[PDB]
């Protein structure tokens, strides 16, 4: 079963510039047939139920706005904040939808500096 | 005739492998040649309706017989029935005992 | 179906000037255009072989240039006797000849 | 003693075995030839939504494969992509021989979750799934296939009249669905216009009109919004049936075209 | 619509008889039909079936060496060919076209055969 | 639009049973596959059960016969019942919808707490 | 030649529920979708509802949101618009429409007067 | 193979009655019972297309109820030409036919 | 999602050369419909797209627009034309408004 | 190579309460052809030789009381006390024979209070 | 439509299928013989560097494989054990049925990284890549193979004279090389006399010279080797 890793366990940042987190899976979540990444983010602010924020690995919930920008192929992943603001602050998930077993990887919470 | 299936195509358009004598190029070589989904050719034969709605229906009809003998046959992949086909009217026509002038042997004198 | 074509239909040349012509393929061909001059009346004689290679005993004026879909054929110099019809020959697949071209002064 | 067509003076008489019939000649193994046909062709309905439930999940049964030299031209071919509803794998992965079919008017392409009861989908019609010269009958994950039977044919006296020569362009369009419940009475379709905009899908829709809904929805629909994914059910609002008529009928001429004002679309939730 | 059969009469045991079900409305080659035996006061039981274009031949286990079956399409009709006929052949024969299930749909009027 | 609310958290003995209720509003429940997610204090987001829309169950090893998970379309209403319960199934049950046709989890309810 | 016939109307007191039915001929009912729009004695047309083709998906107007319900029988070719609540200013000529998209056909108005 | 068995062998009721006959397979057959009305004298009707589609032109009274091992017809009316005998057939392997039912 | 009528009112010759124009607050492509009502009579639908005309429809009764604005535009007025008229969007069709159109009249 | 990893490193809990430990192995140790778990647990109490509690997933040994009940199936497995006497108090280990390293997870700890 | 060679009187005459002729008697399916012949008898150069230029990389193209009765002895095998740069795989890991090309005089054991365009390696002469009984059209990693050409042959009136008998010992030396670039015109090779010491190749060079390189000699070093025309002659002669 694919385990997946954020290797980021806090992520302490000012507002207004880059954040990324990386997700590493333990085997490649690419499906051949149509070359679409079976990776999706979640963000989990405290106090409320996760909600879905790039699937597919890059594509964007509609609600999203521009900024969380998701990216990577295979193995690995990683999401990024083009520019934290501090709505941001939240705990932010990966899963992987490519196989048996769906799984979560363990969180990754960003922190304003 | 075809009716007592619901509808019957008038037109057959056939896709098929190439013919071996047609190409002369360069291209046989595997490495230089067309991938998978080139090698096929193409066909019409929209002009005569009976012979491939006739063959529909018999496409239809075939389908029980093969269906047993892939359930009675342990092949995973079957390519023999044609050449399983040829030997069986080899051995029919000519499996022995065949007389100069008879019904069991096709041959015919002068 | 591979479609020959052979742009400069009627070229006129001078002496001792550079000429190309150019065999332009339907779909790639990998190398695979010969050429071939043919003088009026008499056999066609190959030139160059593979788009690039020169057949031995050419002289080596004649030059060509090879891809998968465009190829062209150079003679550094038009000396007279190099005026005739020159044919370019597509052998990936169906072996079609081009319409020809013919160079004249 | 599968039945062996034979084609005579252009006229198709099965072989008959007992007799031996003196005329008949086989030259060649090169006479000898097996015909994959589409069901398409055989004015069964066509459309993913009932299509699929010809289709069946059994287990038990081993899978078997046929070649056939030579098919015919598909107007709808269907690639499914099925996961289970926690995404455990559905369909056997397709084998390395076997390849989507070769030419496809219209590629069905069904990616979504569905119980999967069975080890292997199977053909409730009998038929076979045509994979590339090859004819299954058991579904492969991910490889386009036709649905169609498989005619054994002992062709004309090898003079190139048959299946040699035309006596008298292929660009494929992948039509790409979203289902839930697939393989059960209780299935539900969407037709996926874009990464954004859904459509419900009933089995009156037919390629053309899917296609055209997908150009109107395009033009004017107003797919892209912040709300979330859309979910549209449609309905051409038109005194006539959509596509009664099937492919080769009346060669599709003197059809009425519902302009994009007739369709009416209204948000399901 | 309509499916008419002939032949039937007295035979001796052995021999053979051949028993002509025609059809009237419907193109018999497009269609599988089949034959049908009620032994009298003993029920209905399966013979033989044919396919449409004739290259499948069925028969039942207890006529499976006897019973030569083949069809004409030319002329909408189907032959039955009874062969070494024994006693218990001695019933009413039916013959009627395939239907969803291998269902007998329409059913020519039974004829007699006695041995 | 799209609401899905939790019940039927509590304390529960070790060992004991409880049952979950997940409302759904704002959507065809009968066609979406729906999802119970387990979120434990320390150890993040974990699935726990899924259930399809003819029924069928599908469950991790964790809760492979210990959960039981049901749908009753009619009333648009989602239930995992919970059986033998030990100290490691205390966490937030959400009941998730994922998109249709596709895993990923696009609508979570908000999260009930249940503690063994 | 597709008639839409009104029926109904009535002088009704406040508060009292009455039904109108559009009669539909001359179309397939299944394939249209149907709406209901109200004419103001002399002030103007105002939409009040809207029913899907088969009859699943009705949306209405804001003043009427609760009080009107529409439903539609595809067998019997009817609409039923069902006047729940009765307002003194819903007095007016009501028309059934027979396309979704663009009123194309409208029946012979209703007159309808709460009183 | 396959033997199939009609419980009732003959049972009589009135006109306007509620009557069922049962086709039972000793092993499973998938829906594939299709039942037959033989007027006595006369060659048999079809009935039911399978356990339960009910053949065109057959009058809606005739029930088909189908399930995995055990099938039953029901006449609903009991008109008089319906009192004529019934078969059942069975399509999962040699096409056999149960007993008859008289009425 | 607001349609409105420019010419609030318009009075004409029986044979004037008249034209109406429909006001949009949205951007609507080619999905206005135009429907005249005679006073004391059913509404009746002229134009499919603002553009496509009805079968019934008499020819003078042609009009285009596109976008945010659209116009009817009658060549030759005739005494039956003497009749409201109305313009529908089409892009957000669950609330359908109709607003009050112009009443065509003798001039 | 199958790694067993047991959850609770350590597991304190009162006498006569149910005692659950968590057992998770990298890949699946059931056997299709018989349906049946390769897998054992073993009770090593302070000082003594590991004792063999049960086998095949969950059956139990002779000797072992009827309180030790194994249950799981596939990736993960669980051994349940159902009654946590004091002298059950030990370090309590997996193991696979399913495959060939015999690996044993890493042992857990109950304690009573 | 493959052409069938009749072997009657010990002289080959390729069969007319459209004549009919009647010399020819197929008594058995034995007399039907598929035979092997490898390419390096046809004259061309069988070095690697030579060798490797006639091998090139597509895609898209299904491998398909042959069956072979009879072979020949190959005086030049090749085995390949290239990984692209990172160590992915390049060449498809050999199908259970494959196995090594027996009776092989070298085996030229080529291992190391290039460039893979291809899924699979093919021949650009259009050859078959033949592999114990077994000819594919593919490069199979890891598997000694020898060029070659399937021929099939209607044996001589079950006589079995021919392939039965000899009308008118097995050591294989492996000659091991490194390459980087394999399958472009950009390849490099230094052939590996021992574990520290390597000579770079050159396409003159023969198996009988680098097998005295390792005499000759006597951080790991690359020796450029100097010894008119070396090995004109085929093999054979
Ligand atoms: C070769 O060609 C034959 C001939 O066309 C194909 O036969 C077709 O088989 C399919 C399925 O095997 C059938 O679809 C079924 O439709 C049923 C609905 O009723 C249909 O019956 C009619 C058929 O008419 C003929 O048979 C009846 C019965 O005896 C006679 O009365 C009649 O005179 C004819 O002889 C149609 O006319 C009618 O319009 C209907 O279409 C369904 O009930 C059926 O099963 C459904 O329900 C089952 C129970 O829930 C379920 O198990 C199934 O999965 C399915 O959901 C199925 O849909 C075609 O009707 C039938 N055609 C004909 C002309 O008989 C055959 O399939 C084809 N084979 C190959 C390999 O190509
Ligand atoms: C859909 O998503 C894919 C993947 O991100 C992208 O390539 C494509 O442009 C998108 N199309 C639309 C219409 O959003
Ligand atoms: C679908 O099939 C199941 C199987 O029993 C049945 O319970 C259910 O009612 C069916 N649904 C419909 C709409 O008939
Ligand atoms: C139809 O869909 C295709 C993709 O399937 C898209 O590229 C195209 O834009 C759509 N049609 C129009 C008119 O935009
Ligand atoms: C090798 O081939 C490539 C591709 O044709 C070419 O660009 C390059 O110049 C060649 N180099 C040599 C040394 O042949
Ligand atoms: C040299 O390499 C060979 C393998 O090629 C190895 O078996 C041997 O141990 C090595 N010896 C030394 C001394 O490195």
Same mark, same amino acid.
């Given at each position: 079963?694919? $385990?997946?890793?954020?290797?980021? /366990?806090?992520?302490?940042?000012?507002?207004?510039?880059?954040?990324?987190?990386?997700?590493?899976?333990?085997?490649?979540?690419?499906? @051949?047939?149509?070359?679409?990444?079976?990776?999706?983010?979640?963000?989990?602010?405290?106090?409320?139920?996760?909600?879905?924020?790039?699937?597919?690995?890059?594509?964007?919930?509609?609600?999203?706005?521009?900024?969380?920008?998701? @990216?990577?192929?295979?193995?690995?992943?990683?999401?990024?904040?083009?520019?934290?603001?501090?709505?941001?602050?939240?705990?932010?998930?990966?899963?992987?939808?490519?196989?048996?077993?769906?799984?979560?990887?363990?969180?990754?919470?960003?922190?304003?500096? | 005739?075809?009716?007592?299936?619901?509808?019957?195509?008038?037109?057959?358009?056939?896709?098929?492998?190439?013919?071996?004598?047609?190409?002369?190029?360069?291209?046989?070589?595997?490495?230089?040649?067309?991938?998978?989904?080139?090698?096929?050719?193409?066909?019409?034969?929209?002009?005569?309706?009976?012979?491939?709605?006739?063959?529909?229906?018999?496409?239809?009809?075939?389908?029980?017989?093969?269906?047993?003998?892939?359930?009675?046959?342990?092949?995973?992949?079957?390519?023999?029935?044609?050449?399983?086909?040829?030997?069986?009217?080899?051995?029919?026509?000519?499996?022995? *005992?065949?007389?100069?002038?008879?019904?069991?042997?096709?041959?015919?004198?002068? | 179906?591979?479609?020959?074509?052979?742009?400069?239909?009627?070229?006129?040349?001078?002496?001792?000037?550079? =000429? *190309?012509?150019?065999?332009?393929?339907?779909?790639?061909?990998?190398?695979?255009?010969?050429?071939?001059?043919?003088?009026?009346?008499?056999?066609?004689?190959?030139?160059?072989?593979?788009?690039? @290679?020169?057949?031995? &005993?050419?002289?080596?004026?004649?030059?060509? @240039?090879?891809?998968?879909?465009?190829?062209?054929?150079?003679?550094?110099?038009?000396?007279?006797?190099?005026?005739?019809?020159?044919?370019?020959?597509?052998?990936?697949?169906?072996? *079609?000849?081009?319409?020809?071209?013919?160079?004249?002064? | 003693?599968?039945?062996?067509?034979?084609?005579?003076?252009?006229?198709?008489?099965?072989?008959?075995?007992?007799?031996?019939?003196?005329?008949?000649?086989?030259?060649?193994?090169?006479?000898?030839?097996?015909?994959?046909?589409?069901?398409?062709?055989?004015?069964?309905?066509?459309?993913?939504?009932?299509?699929?439930?010809?289709?069946?999940?059994?287990?038990?049964?081993?899978?078997?494969?046929?070649?056939?030299?030579?098919?015919?031209?598909?107007?709808?071919?269907?690639?499914? %992509?099925?996961?289970?509803? /926690?995404?455990?794998?559905?369909?056997?992965?397709?084998?390395?021989?076997?390849?989507?079919?070769?030419?496809?008017?219209?590629?069905?392409?069904?990616?979504?979750?569905?119980?999967?009861?069975?080890?292997?989908?199977?053909?409730? %019609?009998?038929?076979?799934?045509?994979?590339?010269?090859?004819?299954?009958? =058991?579904?492969?994950?991910?490889?386009?296939?036709?649905?169609?039977?498989?005619?054994?044919?002992?062709?004309?006296?090898?003079?190139?009249?048959?299946?040699?020569?035309?006596?008298?362009?292929?660009?494929?369009?992948?039509?790409?669905?979203?289902?839930?419940?697939?393989?059960?009475?209780?299935?539900?379709?969407?037709?996926?216009?874009?990464?954004?905009?859904?459509?419900?899908?009933?089995?009156?829709?037919?390629?053309?009109?899917?296609?055209?809904?997908?150009?109107?929805?395009?033009?004017?629909?107003?797919?892209?919004? *912040?709300?979330?994914?859309?979910?549209?059910?449609?309905?051409?609002?038109?005194?006539?049936?959509?596509? %009664?008529?099937?492919?080769?009928?009346?060669?599709? +001429?003197?059809?009425?075209?519902?302009?994009?004002?007739?369709?009416?679309?209204?948000?399901?939730? | 619509?309509?499916?008419?059969?002939?032949?039937?009469?007295?035979?001796?045991?052995?021999?053979?008889?051949?028993?002509?079900?025609?059809?009237?409305?419907?193109?018999?080659?497009?269609?599988?039909?089949?034959?049908?035996?009620?032994?009298?006061?003993?029920?209905?039981?399966?013979?033989?079936?044919?396919?449409?274009?004739?290259?499948?031949?069925?028969?039942?286990?207890?006529?499976?060496?006897?019973?030569?079956?083949?069809?004409?399409?030319?002329?909408?009709?189907?032959?039955?060919?009874?062969?070494?006929?024994?006693?218990?052949?001695?019933?009413?024969?039916?013959?009627?076209?395939?239907?969803?299930?291998?269902?007998?749909?329409?059913?020519?009027?039974?004829?007699?055969?006695?041995? | 639009?799209?609401?899905?609310?939790?019940?039927?958290?509590?304390?529960?003995?070790?060992?004991?049973?409880?049952?979950?209720?997940?409302?759904?509003?704002?959507?065809?429940?009968?066609?979406?596959?729906?999802?119970?997610?387990?979120?434990?204090?320390?150890?993040?987001?974990?699935?726990?059960?899924?259930?399809?829309?003819?029924?069928?169950?599908?469950?991790?090893?964790?809760?492979?016969?210990?959960?039981?998970?049901?749908?009753?379309?009619?009333?648009?209403?989602?239930?995992?019942?919970?059986?033998?319960?030990?100290?490691?199934?205390?966490?937030?049950?959400?009941?998730?919808?994922?998109?249709?046709?596709?895993?990923?989890?696009?609508?979570?309810?908000?999260?009930?707490?249940?503690? $063994? | 030649?597709?008639?839409?016939?009104?029926?109904?109307?009535?002088?009704?007191?406040?508060?009292?529920?009455?039904?109108?039915?559009?009669?539909?001929?001359?179309?397939?009912? +299944?394939?249209?979708?149907?709406?209901?729009?109200?004419?103001?004695?002399?002030? &103007?047309?105002?939409?009040?509802?809207?029913?899907?083709?088969?009859?699943?998906?009705?949306?209405?107007?804001?003043?009427?949101?609760?009080?009107?319900?529409?439903?539609?029988?595809?067998?019997?070719?009817?609409?039923?618009?069902?006047?729940?609540?009765?307002?003194? %200013? /819903?007095?007016?000529?009501?028309?059934?429409?027979?396309?979704?998209?663009?009123?194309?056909?409208?029946?012979? &108005?209703?007159?309808?007067?709460?009183?």
């Amino acid at each position: 079963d694919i $385990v997946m890793t954020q290797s980021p /366990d806090s992520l302490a940042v000012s507002l207004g510039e880059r954040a990324t987190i990386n997700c590493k899976s333990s085997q490649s979540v690419l499906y @051949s047939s149509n070359n679409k990444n079976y990776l999706a983010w979640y963000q989990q602010k405290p106090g409320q139920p996760p909600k879905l924020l790039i699937y597919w690995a890059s594509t964007r919930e509609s609600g999203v706005p521009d900024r969380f920008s998701g @990216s990577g192929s295979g193995t690995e992943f990683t999401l990024t904040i083009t520019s934290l603001q501090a709505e941001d602050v939240a705990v932010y998930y990966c899963q992987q939808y490519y196989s048996s077993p769906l799984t979560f990887g363990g969180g990754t919470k960003v922190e304003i500096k | 005739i075809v009716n007592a299936q619901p509808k019957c195509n008038p037109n057959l358009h056939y896709w098929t492998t190439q013919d071996e004598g047609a190409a002369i190029g360069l291209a046989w070589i595997p490495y230089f040649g067309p991938a998978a989904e080139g090698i096929y050719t193409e066909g019409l034969m929209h002009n005569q309706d009976g012979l491939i709605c006739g063959l529909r229906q018999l496409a239809n009809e075939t389908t029980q017989a093969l269906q047993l003998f892939l359930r009675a046959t342990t092949e995973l992949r079957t390519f023999s029935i044609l050449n399983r086909k040829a030997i069986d009217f080899l051995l029919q026509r000519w499996g022995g *005992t065949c007389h100069i002038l008879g019904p069991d042997c096709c041959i015919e004198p002068h | 179906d591979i479609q020959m074509t052979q742009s400069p239909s009627s070229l006129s040349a001078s002496v001792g000037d550079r =000429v *190309t012509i150019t065999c332009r393929a339907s779909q790639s061909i990998s190398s695979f255009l010969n050429w071939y001059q043919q003088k009026p009346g008499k056999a066609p004689k190959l030139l160059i072989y593979a788009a690039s @290679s020169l057949q031995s &005993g050419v002289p080596s004026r004649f030059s060509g @240039s090879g891809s998968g879909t465009d190829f062209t054929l150079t003679i550094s110099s038009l000396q007279p006797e190099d005026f005739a019809t020159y044919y370019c020959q597509q052998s990936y697949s169906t072996l *079609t000849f081009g319409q020809g071209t013919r160079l004249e002064i | 003693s599968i039945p062996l067509g034979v084609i005579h003076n252009s006229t198709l008489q099965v072989s008959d075995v007992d007799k031996l019939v003196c005329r008949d000649k086989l030259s060649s193994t090169n006479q000898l030839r097996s015909v994959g046909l589409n069901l398409e062709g055989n004015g069964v309905a066509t459309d993913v939504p009932s299509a699929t439930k010809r289709w069946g999940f059994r287990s038990g049964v081993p899978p078997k494969v046929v070649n056939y030299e030579a098919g015919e031209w598909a107007e709808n071919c269907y690639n499914l %992509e099925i996961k289970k509803p /926690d995404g455990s794998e559905c369909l056997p992965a397709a084998p390395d021989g076997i390849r989507g079919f070769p030419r496809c008017r219209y590629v069905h392409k069904v990616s979504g979750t569905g119980p999967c009861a069975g080890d292997f989908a199977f053909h409730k %019609e009998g038929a076979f799934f045509l994979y590339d010269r090859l004819a299954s009958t =058991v579904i492969y994950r991910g490889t386009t296939f036709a649905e169609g039977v498989v005619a054994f044919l002992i062709l004309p006296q090898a003079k190139k009249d048959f299946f040699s020569s035309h006596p008298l362009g292929y660009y494929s369009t992948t039509i790409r669905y979203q289902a839930t419940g697939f393989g059960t009475n209780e299935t539900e379709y969407l037709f996926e216009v874009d990464n954004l905009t859904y459509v419900q899908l009933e089995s009156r829709f037919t390629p053309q009109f899917l296609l055209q809904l997908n150009e109107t929805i395009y033009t004017s629909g107003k797919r892209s919004n *912040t709300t979330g994914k859309l979910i549209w059910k449609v309905n051409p609002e038109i005194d006539t049936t959509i596509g %009664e008529w099937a492919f080769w009928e009346t060669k599709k +001429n003197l059809t009425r075209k519902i302009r994009s004002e007739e369709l009416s679309f209204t948000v399901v939730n | 619509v309509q499916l008419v059969e002939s032949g039937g009469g007295l035979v001796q045991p052995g021999g053979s008889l051949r028993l002509s079900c025609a059809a009237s409305g419907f193109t018999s080659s497009s269609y599988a039909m089949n034959w049908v035996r009620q032994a009298p006061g003993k029920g209905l039981e399966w013979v033989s079936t044919i396919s449409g274009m004739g290259g499948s031949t069925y028969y039942a286990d207890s006529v499976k060496g006897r019973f030569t079956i083949s069809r004409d399409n030319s002329k909408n009709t189907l032959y039955l060919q009874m062969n070494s006929l024994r006693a218990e052949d001695t019933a009413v024969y039916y013959c009627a076209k395939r239907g969803y299930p291998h269902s007998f749909d329409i059913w020519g009027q039974g004829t007699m055969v006695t041995v | 639009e799209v609401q899905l609310v939790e019940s039927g958290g509590g304390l529960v003995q070790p060992g004991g049973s409880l049952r979950l209720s997940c409302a759904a509003s704002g959507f065809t429940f009968s066609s979406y596959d729906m999802h119970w997610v387990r979120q434990a204090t320390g150890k993040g987001l974990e699935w726990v059960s899924a259930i399809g829309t003819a029924g069928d169950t599908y469950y991790p090893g964790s809760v492979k016969g210990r959960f039981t998970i049901s749908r009753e379309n009619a009333k648009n209403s989602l239930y995992l019942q919970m059986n033998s319960l030990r100290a490691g199934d205390t966490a937030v049950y959400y009941c998730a919808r994922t998109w249709f046709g596709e895993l990923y989890f696009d609508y979570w309810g908000q999260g009930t707490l249940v503690t $063994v | 030649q597709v008639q839409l016939v009104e029926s109904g109307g009535g002088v009704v007191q406040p508060g009292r529920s009455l039904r109108l039915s559009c009669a539909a001929s001359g179309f397939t009912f +299944n394939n249209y979708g149907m709406h209901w729009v109200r004419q103001a004695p002399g002030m &103007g047309l105002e939409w009040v509802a809207v029913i899907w083709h088969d009859g699943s998906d009705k949306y209405y107007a804001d003043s009427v949101k609760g009080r009107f319900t529409i439903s539609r029988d595809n067998s019997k070719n009817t609409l039923y618009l069902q006047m729940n609540s009765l307002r003194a %200013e /819903d007095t007016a000529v009501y028309y059934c429409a027979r396309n979704w998209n663009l009123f194309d056909y409208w029946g012979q &108005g209703t007159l309808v007067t709460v009183s």
